[PDB]
UniProtKB/Swiss-Prot annotation:
Residues 8-64 form the Tudor domain. Signal peptide: none annotated. Belongs to the SMN family. Involved in spliceosome assembly. It is found in: Nucleus speckle; Nucleus, Cajal body. This is Survival of motor neuron-related-splicing factor 30. Associates with spliceosomes. Associates with U4/U5/U6 tri-snRNP and with U2 snRNP. Interacts (via Tudor domain) with SNRPD3 (via C-terminus); the interaction is direct. Transmembrane segments: none annotated. The Tudor domain mediates association with dimethylarginines, which are common in snRNP proteins.
Length: 64
């Protein structure tokens, strides 16, 4: 509705989602983006865990 993304994310991009179980940020790939709720279904690479987390929890992959 009035959800203005805090971070410009796209489908098929790598990000760092905050695991709702441990609370730490692991590497995850965006499979789907729901701008209606401001959330995005991400899948942690290597693990296989997929959860719907907001775009505010999605941090950029800082490798440099
Ligand atoms: N099934 C499993 N998932 C994880 C995991 C770890 C970090 C982030 C997401 N998932 C570990 S074992």
């Amino acid at each position: 509705a009035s959800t203005q993304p805090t971070h410009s994310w796209k489908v098929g991009d790598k990000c760092m989602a905050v695991w709702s179980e441990d609370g730490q940020c692991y590497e995850a790939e965006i499979e789907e983006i729901d701008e209606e709720n401001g959330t995005a279904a991400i899948t942690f690479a290597g693990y296989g865990n997929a959860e719907v987390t907001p775009l505010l929890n999605l941090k950029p992959v800082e490798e440099g």
